[PDB]
Design a protein around this ligand. Structure first.
Ligand SMILES: Cc1cc2nc3c(=O)[nH]c(=O)nc-3n(C[C@H](O)[C@H](O)[C@H](O)COP(=O)(O)OP(=O)(O)OC[C@H]3O[C@@H](n4cnc5c(N)ncnc54)[C@H](O)[C@@H]3O)c2cc1C
Ligand SMILES: C[C@H]1CCN2C[C@]34Cc5c([nH]c6c7c(ccc56)OC(C)(C)C=CO7)C(C)(C)[C@@H]3C[C@]12C(=O)N4
Length: 438
C-alpha cells in the first residue's frame, strides 16, 4: 500500500488522514502543537463537506456530529436601527445536513476517529525540510530537544495551514498577502453567564427549535450572531476597519472595549452588547483579514508533494466555505490516489490539482469580492458582506462522484500535456475572475 506523510493536523490534515486511511493507505501524520486544546470559535461545514464526512465510518462520524446539525431556517439581516431588512431562505442550503460547531469540538471528533481506524499520529513534532526523488519523498521530523529524524513515504501532504513553512520551503509566494484594512472580532460567548443575565435572555428565543442566525449591517461593522446545539453554544463575528499591523494568529487577545465603542452609538448597540459582553477576555480575538492570491502550483516539480487547505488557498474565515473547500481537497486527493495506484502517485497528485484548482480559486476570489466593498447604510437585496453567496454549484456539489467520472479525462489531459477545463464551477465565473488553469 501507499505510504502517506501528512504535515499539519488542522481540519484539512485530519480529513486527509481519515480519507486516505479509509481508502486503504498507510498514514503517518505529524503535528507540532497540542490540538485537543479549546481555542478559537465556530467552524461551519456546508453540504459539500458533510456528504464527504457522511461516508466516514459508515456514518459514525456524522452520528457523532448530529447535535451540531444546523436547524436555522433563515438568515435574518438587520440594519443599525434593528429593522429586519432581508430574510435569506436556507431551506435549500439546509436540505442536506450542514454543521456549525466549535473548532475544538470538530477537531476532537475527527481525531478520535482517525486513531480508531489506525492513523499513525505524532504530536509535538515540527516537520521541516521536505525532499523528493522520483521513487519517494521524505521529511525531517524535529523534536524540541534538537533531534532530527528522516521519515520516508511515497508522498507528502502539506496541510500545515496559512503559515505553511512547507510552502516557504518549496514553492513560496513572491509577495506577502497585503492587509485589506479590515479585521474580525470573533469569539464564543460564555454560556454559563449568558444565562442568568436577564437583559440577554432575548437571544434564547426559539434557539431550541431553530438555531439563531442574525446579521447586522452598521457603518464600518458587519456583525453576525449564531447559536448551535439548542442554545448550548453562541458565537459572534464582527468585521470592522483596522489599519494596525496585527498578526493573523489565533491567540492574541484584544480589548473588548473597542467592540463596545463600535456599536454603542447605534440604537441596536445595547441589545447586541448584552450578549457580546459575556465573552471571556481570554477569548476575544481580533483577526486581520488578508487577501491571499492563488498559487501558481500546488504540486511540486517532482510530483510527490502537494499543498492542500489553508496552505494552498487561504480564504477569509468569513467565507463560509473555508473549511469545506479543504475537506473537498482531501476527498479528491484520496479518490485520485485510489484510481491511480502506487505506481502512478505523481499522476494522482497532478490530477487532484487540476480538479480542485479552478473551483477553489473561484471560491477564493468570489468570497473576497463579496467581502470587499464600500456599501452605505441602505443595504439592498443582493448587496458590504452579507453571507448570501450560498450557490448550489458550491454546496450541492459531490466532489468524489465528480472525481470518479472525470478521472480518465484529466489523466488524458495530464499525459497529453493539454489543459483540463473543469466543470465543477460555472463557466462564466472563470472568465469573469480571470482564472488561469494550473
Ligand atoms: C489554533 C487555531 C484556531 C483556529 N480557530 C478557527 C476558528 O475559530 N474559526 C475558523 O473559521 N477558523 C479557525 N482556524 C482556521 C481553520 O482551521 C482553517 O481556516 C481551515 O478551516 C482549516 O485549514 P487547515 O486545516 O488547512 O489549517 P489549520 O487549521 O490552520 O491547521 C494547520 C495545522 O498545522 C500545524 N503545523 C504547521 N506547521 C507545522 C509543521 N511544520 N509540522 C507540524 N504541524 C505543523 C499547525 O500547528 C496547525 O495545527 C483556526 C486555526 C488554528 C491553527
Ligand atoms: C462578519 C459577519 C457578517 C456576516 N457573517 C456571515 C459570515 C459567513 C458565514 C458564517 N457562518 C456561516 C454559515 C453558513 C454559511 C455562511 C456562513 O451556513 C451554514 C448552513 C453552514 C450554517 C452556519 O454557518 C459566519 C461565521 C457567521 C460569517 C460571519 C459574517 C461574515 O462576514 N461572513
Amino acid at each position: 500500500e501507499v505510504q502517506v506523510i501528512i504535515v499539519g493536523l488542522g481540519i484539512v490534515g485530519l480529513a486527509a488522514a481519515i480519507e486516505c486511511r479509509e481508502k486503504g493507505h498507510s498514514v503517518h501524520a505529524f503535528e507540532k502543537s497540542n490540538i485537543l486544546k479549546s481555542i478559537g470559535d465556530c467552524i461551519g461545514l456546508q453540504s459539500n463537506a458533510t456528504r464527504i464526512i457522511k461516508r466516514w465510518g459508515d456514518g459514525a462520524v456524522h452520528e457523532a456530529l448530529r447535535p451540531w446539525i444546523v436547524s436555522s431556517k433563515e438568515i435574518r439581516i438587520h440594519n443599525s436601527s434593528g429593522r429586519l431588512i432581508i430574510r435569506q431562505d436556507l431551506s435549500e442550503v439546509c436540505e442536506q445536513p450542514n454543521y456549525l460547531l466549535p473548532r475544538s469540538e470538530l477537531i476532537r471528533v475527527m481525531y478520535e476517529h482517525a486513531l480508531k481506524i489506525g492513523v499513525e499520529i505524532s504530536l509535538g513534532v515540527e516537520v521541516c525540510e521536505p525532499s523528493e526523488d522520483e521513487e519517494g519523498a521524505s521529511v525531517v521530523a524535529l523534536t524540541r530537544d534538537g533531534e532530527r529524524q528522516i521519515v520516508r513515504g511515497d508522498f507528502i501532504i502539506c496541510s500545515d495551514g496559512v503559515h505553511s513553512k512547507m510552502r516557504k520551503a518549496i514553492m513560496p509566494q513572491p509577495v506577502e498577502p497585503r492587509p485589506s484594512g479590515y479585521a474580525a472580532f470573533r469569539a464564543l460567548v460564555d454560556t454559563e453567564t449568558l444565562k442568568g443575565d436577564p437583559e440577554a435572555s432575548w437571544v434564547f428565543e426559539g434557539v431550541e427549535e431553530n438555531d439563531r442566525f442574525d446579521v447586522f449591517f452598521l457603518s464600518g461593522a458587519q456583525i453576525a450572531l449564531q447559536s448551535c446545539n439548542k442554545g448550548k453554544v453562541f458565537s459572534w463575528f464582527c468585521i470592522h476597519q483596522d489599519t494596525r499591523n496585527l498578526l493573523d494568529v489565533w491567540t492574541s487577545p484584544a480589548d473588548p472595549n473597542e467592540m463596545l465603542d463600535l456599536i454603542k452609538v447605534w440604537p441596536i448597540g445595547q441589545r447586541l452588547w448584552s450578549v457580546i459582553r459575556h465573552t471571556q477576555p481570554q477569548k476575544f480575538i481580533n483577526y486581520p483579514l488578508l487577501n491571499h492570491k492563488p498559487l501558481d502550483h500546488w504540486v511540486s516539480s517532482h510530483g510527490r508533494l502537494i499543498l492542500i487547505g489553508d496552505a494552498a488557498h487561504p480564504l477569509s474565515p468569513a467565507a463560509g466555505q473555508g473549511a469545506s473547500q479543504g475537506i473537498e481537497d482531501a476527498n479528491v486527493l484520496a479518490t485520485s490516489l485510489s484510481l491511480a495506484g502506487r505506481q502512478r502517485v505523481s499522476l494522482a497528485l497532478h490530477v487532484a490539482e487540476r480538479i480542485r484548482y479552478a473551483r477553489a480559486s473561484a471560491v477564493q476570489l468570489i468570497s473576497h469580492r463579496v467581502n470587499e466593498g464600500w456599501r452605505n447604510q441602505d443595504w439592498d437585496a443582493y448587496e458590504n458582506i452579507a453571507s448570501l453567496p450560498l450557490e448550489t454549484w458550491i454546496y450541492g456539489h459531490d466532489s468524489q462522484a465528480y472525481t470518479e467520472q472525470e478521472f480518465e479525462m484529466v489523466v488524458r489531459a495530464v499525459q497529453e500535456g493539454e489543459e483540463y477545463h473543469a466543470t465543477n464551477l460555472p463557466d462564466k465565473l472563470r472568465v469573469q475572475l480571470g482564472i488561469r488553469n494550473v
